[PDB]
Ligand binder design. Structure first.
Ligand SMILES: *[C@@H]1O[C@H](CO)[C@@H](O[C@@H]2O[C@H](CO)[C@@H](O[C@@H]3O[C@H](CO)[C@@H](O)[C@H](O)[C@H]3NC(C)=O)[C@H](O)[C@H]2NC(C)=O)[C@H](O)[C@H]1NC(C)=O
Ligand SMILES: *[C@@H]1O[C@H](CO)[C@@H](O[C@@H]2O[C@H](CO)[C@@H](O)[C@H](O)[C@H]2NC(C)=O)[C@H](O)[C@H]1NC(C)=O
Ligand SMILES: *[C@@H]1O[C@H](CO)[C@@H](O[C@@H]2O[C@H](CO)[C@@H](O)[C@H](O)[C@H]2NC(C)=O)[C@H](O)[C@H]1NC(C)=O
Ligand SMILES: *[C@@H]1O[C@H](CO)[C@@H](O[C@@H]2O[C@H](CO)[C@@H](O)[C@H](O)[C@H]2NC(C)=O)[C@H](O)[C@H]1NC(C)=O
Ligand SMILES: *[C@@H]1O[C@H](CO)[C@@H](O[C@@H]2O[C@H](CO)[C@@H](O)[C@H](O)[C@H]2NC(C)=O)[C@H](O)[C@H]1NC(C)=O
Ligand SMILES: *[C@@H]1O[C@H](CO)[C@@H](O[C@@H]2O[C@H](CO)[C@@H](O)[C@H](O)[C@H]2NC(C)=O)[C@H](O)[C@H]1NC(C)=O
Ligand SMILES: *[C@@H]1O[C@H](CO)[C@@H](O)[C@H](O)[C@H]1NC(C)=O
Ligand SMILES: *[C@@H]1O[C@H](CO)[C@@H](O)[C@H](O)[C@H]1NC(C)=O
Ligand SMILES: *[C@@H]1O[C@H](CO)[C@@H](O)[C@H](O)[C@H]1NC(C)=O
Ligand SMILES: *[C@@H]1O[C@H](CO)[C@@H](O)[C@H](O)[C@H]1NC(C)=O
Lengths: 374, 346, 345, 382
């Protein structure tokens, strides 16, 4: 047999009233040291004081909740005793009131929120703190300290002292508390239950345009509904952009189907349809071009002229291709001229005529050009 | 010794009780013995009370104003009722609960306000009845109550909210309230419910009812699903895929939550030399993510000077300083996801 | 045919859909339109839409009892041509607009008890004029469209157990001979009009008027002479009778007071076409009725060339050149007819 | 025996739909003529039609309520038949719809309201009408016409407002009194009005009398005062307040028996009148409210004692209100310089010492009260 030896002794912690304070104590020996907590040589009795036995059975944790002052301001001792021997160590407890909080006391900037992760997945309990000096972060699962000494599953992150739990399991379910501590004192955070569920097995498929944005051609100041549909699991958030600017406030974003309702289109421009999920970002372009009225063609010039016929030639006078032209003539309009040249026949000998040319496209009929005498 | 007309007041050792139930009273009896201890004005037709009514009634331990047409209560009218233990204001037309009403009711253990038209309850109105045992606020138009005052009610065991329009409920409640033995929150507008060890004790001591609520059946309610309670005809409302089906008819594997995704963030920004710099960062998911920001090293303040925070997902640093350039990163907290993106400023 | 969680049974000759106590949050999407009875009682529906009860023509009985209904889409109760009984008790309804009950001719039973009704728009009942029962108890009502009620000859039961009703017209309950029960307990009624139906309540007809701030004057002497059973009624005014039971007071103590003109205009000189305002007011129990007379006749009310009644003030707008004569102010009362005179020039 | 002879035949009246129409018919004979009403040779059967037998039993009244059109537009006949004979006369009834009302149709400007008069007292049912031509007024008690033929002493119709003055009321007067207007255009009925007759209330009628008259008061400038006025008697009078021309209280809020006027910021002295008024006359009362002002100049100081270096002054108060102290002004005879004042004189006499030999002085006396300091009185030489 061997008399008990303290491998780690409890330290003097300064907690705040209305909060929680926990003390750790564990030792080794043969047989295993049965640890009992005492106050002024008296075992704890009050309901607010609770002792939690370790999984090893080689130690115990005394949790005090809630903290009060100066009702709980006293000195406590940890007694590890077995058949061969008995040892004990004392520690001081300081409980500061809410109006006694010093300037620079640990403050929970961000406490752990409720989280749920499936089996064999990464869990990340978050926490943050501030004060003078910078407090370090310790975690408490099920009123017990988490063993994050060295890189063994459960690791504390180097500086944001989160609790990255890789390869989650059944035993990981419990109440996770966050604790900040410096030279000023110790502050606990709000509890957060962690639950682990079975594997869901969902097919993860990147975003894909089911119905791509079709091109369109609209008259000046013409409203138009362009539609864009994307599918996949998970469903992507479809939006619209003018390259630099966006239309939707991103607060109300539809799933799978987005219909952009445009209005008063004055100038041709490209609209971008973007769908985005957790599996990447895809893009698509919708063509909105404005078709306008034809400009007046070039002034018709009499290239050939006979007794009963006069030939007209002219320039298109348009950047866009022209379907056909309409020749006006009088001392009556000639429709259906697919070329830029036409011979007006059936005229009187020795007679002066006036000729105009009009361009017509898919939109409609443009203005008449400047006339020509002959 | 003196009891008003139409009232039957009997004298028993050592306390005087005045009974005036079903007397067709239009207002409070003018000459009630102030050293009375029990006073029944139930099933009458009183419209409003004055200070002179219950002025000097110190020995009063039980007051009953059940089933009346009360629409208004004088401020500081329930004063001087230092020994009042039970108060019944059920079945009336009360609209508001001001602080001046229940001021000075320390020994009040029973407070009943069911079947009324309560719209608003001012804060700190319950900061004197902190030692009560029963609070009935069922059948009203309430949406929020001073929860902070409720947490200071350790001796609470019964809280009735059978029919209201309550929006949500804090998570820190029912911490010190170990005495809780019954809680009914039926027929409300609750989206979710916080996990508490008292609810774990409702399996087959504690009896809760949460039926008739627009439940948001996600992974945030999985703990209640694992809880093998009896079917009380509960019904889910969202997600739309689960809308309509019973809460207990849905398998545990179908209560899913969604990891956040940042839709849009500012690519780059050039607001040096102290001009106003507005940053944009937003993410969506089920449930709604929690957006936090970091400086090159550390996180900033909430709702205070030098920082704008939380909702909108927008950092506004008011009038920025000359040198605040560095590496800033946006995050999104969630029970199942931790998405994040980065943004630089110069 | 019948939605999930609902037990709809088919019995000759009418189809009934039962969905009571099912924890429903809104109306079931696929209810058979050719249903005849529909029970949605004891659920938790917040609001109704037009698509809910759109094509339910064969519906004869609808039950929406004990829910959390706060708003109903206009013209949602339309196309219910054969609906006879409607149960909207125990909810959170606030207003009664005309668009609600429009087109409900065959409605015989209308139940609205245990709600928060504040206002009821006029002509909202001008389609349910052939009902047999109207329950408006336990609400915040003070006035109802009485004009629509008078056109309900087939009425026999009107429930107003708990409201805040100011007063009630005298011309009502004239053609309504079928009336067999009327409850007006727990209201703010000052007086009650005399009606032959109330004479039939002595020891067929059963009325309850307890819990009311009665103004025990000679205007209620008819009800006192009526030897009904004591239903714990209590008077409120005059102050000499305040507190005592309505039936414990002898008939000789129900007194009224003759009017008295407090102040009147001595003389008036209203040339230049200016507004001529005369003042005359009187007091009494109950409040007197002020009327003005021409040399031999009385003028028009609230119309051109005359201002009348309340305020007790004749305003002739832009007066004419010749309106001089003898004008006299009076004060009507159940026991008195005091009067005084005033001249104008 | 004697064959029946019509004492009163029904006339053609034109009523409106939704209203009421009544037909009268009574005759005499041996035996008494039993009157039956017929339509198209058929006795009335519908519920809306009701026949009311006269007190005499010599006639009957056919009341139709409510009126409808054209369901009731028909010709009716009255048959008075007995053992000796049988007679009959016909009459037409015209029921105009709401869209057929002509311009100048009888209109009830004021219908009879509910009235209650004690036994052996005058009852006055009121009514008014208008139209073209001017319609005459007929009354209907208990669905029966009221006998207002001549000035008998019991029931009289008023004429210069065709009211129904019922002197010496009795038990039989209780019933439903209806008002009816009729001209060449048609006939319109008014709203019913129940009349109740109670026992005589032996109450002492005593004119208004001031129990507590308004007491006089004297208040400092810009102060406040509660003036009370109480009157008693049966019936109790309504007490108000007037400043001669203007009234203070609104005519809606007038107290009974006791009126207390709460004044504030009293700027000028004035009399306020307290008027109490009942049905037995009007009485008045005056409250004296006077503002205390600066003191009047005291009596001219007289040299009672005089030495070489001291002079004693004596004077009258010259004030109705008490004076706090006095201030003596003093200067040499021909001194054209501002006066010197001696403050703190609680009595009406003071000896000014410290004077020059062979020198005439001038002395003035000023009064000072709670308000302030008044003017200086005329001086005295020595
Ligand atoms: C909006 O969408 C349009 C696609 O439908 C794009 O239209 C293109 O504009 C380009 C000019 O900016 C043209 O590129 C030219 O193409 C010719 C050969 O066709 C080359 O020789 C030129 O080098 C090349 N010039 C440039 C500057 O690239 C395209 O011809 C033209 N394509 C079509 C189908 O019309 C627009 O680019 C696009 N606008 C924006 C801002 O994205
Ligand atoms: C986009 O599509 C909608 C219908 O899908 C069009 O609907 C218009 O607006 C309302 C519908 O809310 C209807 O009452 C109108 O009759 C519709 N007008 C037309 C011309 O159809 C809408 O026009 C389209 N929007 C744009 C900008 O084109
Ligand atoms: C502080 O942050 C909270 C949001 O968490 C804001 O509190 C809101 O304040 C209004 C009253 O002004 C309440 O009606 C809201 O219910 C509160 N919202 C929440 C979620 O509680 C508050 O606006 C912020 N204050 C400042 C200066 O930013
Ligand atoms: C949330 O969003 C809007 C802008 O999208 C904010 O409106 C700004 O409010 C501040 C004052 O607090 C103004 O200086 C800005 O000019 C407003 N911005 C715009 C574009 O108008 C709104 O205040 C934000 N609310 C919160 C709580 O952040
Ligand atoms: C009630 O029934 C009518 C027909 O029985 C429905 O009207 C038809 O609705 C469909 C589209 O939903 C149209 O294709 C038909 O042309 C309509 N027919 C007629 C005559 O209008 C009506 O939709 C039903 N009510 C509701 C709310 O759906
Ligand atoms: C208030 O009433 C008194 C009593 O009449 C008035 O005193 C009289 O005033 C007139 C002149 O104003 C004198 O001629 C009388 O001799 C006074 N009579 C008495 C008995 O004193 C007094 O003037 C009135 N004050 C006001 C402001 O009206
Ligand atoms: C209440 O008690 C006090 C004694 O301090 C007394 O002065 C007061 O008049 C009493 N008020 C009533 C309404 O009895
Ligand atoms: C007459 O006019 C006033 C407003 O001008 C109105 O308030 C009142 O209700 C009307 N009274 C009658 C009897 O028409
Ligand atoms: C009614 O009386 C009030 C007095 O407060 C007055 O203001 C109002 O002008 C009067 N109404 C009319 C129409 O004269
Ligand atoms: C006089 O009137 C004032 C009004 O504020 C009141 O405070 C005071 O009690 C009154 N005094 C008397 C004797 O009525």
């Amino acid at each position: 047999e061997t008399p008990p030896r303290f491998t780690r002794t409890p330290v003097d912690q300064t907690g705040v009233s209305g909060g929680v304070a926990s003390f750790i104590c564990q030792a080794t020996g043969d047989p295993r040291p049965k640890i009992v907590w005492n106050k002024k040589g008296k075992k704890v009795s009050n309901q607010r004081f609770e002792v939690i036995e370790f999984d090893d059975g080689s130690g115990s944790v005394l949790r005090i909740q809630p903290l009060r002052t100066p009702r709980d301001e006293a000195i406590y001792e940890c007694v590890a005793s077995n058949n061969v021997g008995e040892i004990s160590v004392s520690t001081r407890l300081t409980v500061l009131r809410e109006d006694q909080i010093p300037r620079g006391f640990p403050t929970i900037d961000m406490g752990p929120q409720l989280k749920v992760v499936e089996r064999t997945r990464t869990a990340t309990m978050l926490c943050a703190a501030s004060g003078n000096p910078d407090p370090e972060i310790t975690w408490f699962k099920d009123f017990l300290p988490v063993d994050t000494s060295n890189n063994n599953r459960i690791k504390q992150l180097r500086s944001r002292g989160a609790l990255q739990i890789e390869q989650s399991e059944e035993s990981d379910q419990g109440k996770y508390e966050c604790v900040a501590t410096n030279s000023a004192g110790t502050r606990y955070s709000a509890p957060a239950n962690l639950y682990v569920r079975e594997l869901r097995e969902v097919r993860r498929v990147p975003p894909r345009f089911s119905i791509p944005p079709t091109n369109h051609e609209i008259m000046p100041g013409g409203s138009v509904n362009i539609t864009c549909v994307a599918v996949g699991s998970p469903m992507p958030y479809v939006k619209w952009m003018l390259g630099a600017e966006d239309l939707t406030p991103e607060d109300d974003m539809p799933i799978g189907r987005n219909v952009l309702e445009l209005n008063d289109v004055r100038q041709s421009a490209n609209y971008t349809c973007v769908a985005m999920s957790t599996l990447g970002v895809i893009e698509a372009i919708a063509q909105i071009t404005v078709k306008a009225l034809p400009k007046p063609p070039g002034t018709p010039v009499v290239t050939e002229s006979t007794a009963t016929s006069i030939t007209l030639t002219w320039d298109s006078g348009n950047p866009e291709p022209v379907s056909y032209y309409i020749i006006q003539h009088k001392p009556k309009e000639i429709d259906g001229i697919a070329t830029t040249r036409y011979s007006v026949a059936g005229l009187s000998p020795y007679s002066d005529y006036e000729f105009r040319v009009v361009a017509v496209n898919n939109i409609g009929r443009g203005p008449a050009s400047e006339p020509v005498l002959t | 010794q003196i009891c008003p007309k139409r009232c039957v007041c009997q004298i028993l050792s050592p306390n005087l009780a005045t009974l005036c139930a079903k007397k067709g009273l239009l207002f409070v009896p003018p000459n009630i013995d102030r050293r009375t201890v029990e006073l029944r004005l139930a099933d009458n037709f009183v419209t409003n009370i004055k200070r002179k009514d219950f002025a000097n009634m110190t020995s009063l331990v039980d007051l009953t104003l059940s089933r009346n047409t009360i629409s208004f209560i004088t401020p500081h009218a329930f004063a001087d009722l230092r020994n009042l233990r039970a108060l019944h204001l059920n079945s009336n037309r009360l609209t508001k609960i001001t602080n001046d009403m229940f001021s000075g009711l320390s020994n009040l253990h029973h407070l009943i306000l069911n079947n009324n038209q309560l719209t608003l309850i001012s804060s700190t109105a319950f900061d004197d009845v902190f030692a009560l045992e029963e609070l009935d606020l069922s059948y009203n138009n309430l949406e929020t109550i001073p929860w902070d005052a409720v947490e200071k009610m350790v001796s609470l065991h019964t809280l009735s909210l059978d029919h209201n329009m309550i929006d949500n409920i804090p998570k820190g409640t029912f911490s010190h309230l170990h005495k809780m033995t019954r809680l009914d929150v039926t027929s409300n507008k609750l989206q979710k419910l916080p996990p508490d060890p008292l609810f774990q004790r409702a399996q087959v001591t504690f009896a809760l009812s949460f039926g008739g609520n627009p439940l948001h059946c996600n992974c945030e309610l999985l703990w209640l699903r694992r809880l093998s309670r009896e079917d009380d005809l509960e019904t889910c409302a969202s997600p739309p895929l689960l809308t309509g089906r019973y809460f207990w008819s849905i398998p545990e594997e179908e209560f899913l939550c969604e990891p956040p995704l940042i839709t849009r963030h500012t690519h780059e920004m050039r607001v040096l030399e102290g001009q106003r710099a507005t940053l944009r960062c937003k993410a969506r998911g089920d449930p709604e993510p929690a957006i936090h920001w970091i400086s090159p090293e550390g996180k900033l303040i909430s709702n205070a000077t030098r920082s704008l925070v939380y909702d909108n997902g927008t950092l506004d640093i008011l009038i920025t300083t000359v040198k605040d350039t560095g590496a800033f990163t946006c995050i999104a907290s969630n029970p199942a996801g931790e998405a994040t993106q980065i943004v630089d400023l110069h």
